[PDB]
Design a protein around this nucleic acid. Structure first.
Ligand SMILES: [Cl-]
Ligand SMILES: [Zn+2]
Ligand SMILES: [Zn+2]
Ligand SMILES: [Zn+2]
Length: 117
DNA sequence: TGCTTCTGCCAATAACG
DNA sequence: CGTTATTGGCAAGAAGCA
């Protein structure tokens, strides 16, 4: 009982018992619920900040290494995260990387070990 | 106002038996 | 060891700062 279910128009939703946020996926509810329970801790390996989600920790750790995984394909400049990449492409090249063309490249993470695609 | 950090989807990984 | 369960990387918009 970390949740209850709402069903509307046949659509099933999962509701956090603590903050009442709704989720389409039970996986999302559980991932989210750690924020309340802190059953799992995700400590930074370079400082000792601790995160409630594994992905928050990983994004943070990349800031420590300084790796620049995001590369603008228009001019070659590289950026540490999606937001800097996107902002660059929008302001400098007047294009939207969420459009129908691929304007950037996401290099593999090499400054540390995360699972790979 | 401009950085900065904060859930659906499903591939990669793990757990199971 | 291969079948099922779980993890968490990713996008990109939202929210949270100051
Ligand atoms: Cl780099
Ligand atoms: Zn909650
Ligand atoms: Zn850290
Ligand atoms: Zn560029």
């Amino acid at each position: 009982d970390d949740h209850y279910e709402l069903i509307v128009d046949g659509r099933v939703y999962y509701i956090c018992i603590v903050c009442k946020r709704s989720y389409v996926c039970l996986t999302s509810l559980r991932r989210h619920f750690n924020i309340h329970s802190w059953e799992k801790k995700y400590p930074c390996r370079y400082c000792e900040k601790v995160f409630p989600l594994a992905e928050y920790r990983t994004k943070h750790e990349i800031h420590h290494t300084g790796e620049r995984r995001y590369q603008c394909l228009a001019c070659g400049k590289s950026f540490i995260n999606y937001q800097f990449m996107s902002s660059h492409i929008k302001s400098v090249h007047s294009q939207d990387p969420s459009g129908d063309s691929k304007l950037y490249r996401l290099h593999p993470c090499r400054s540390l070990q995360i699972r790979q695609y």
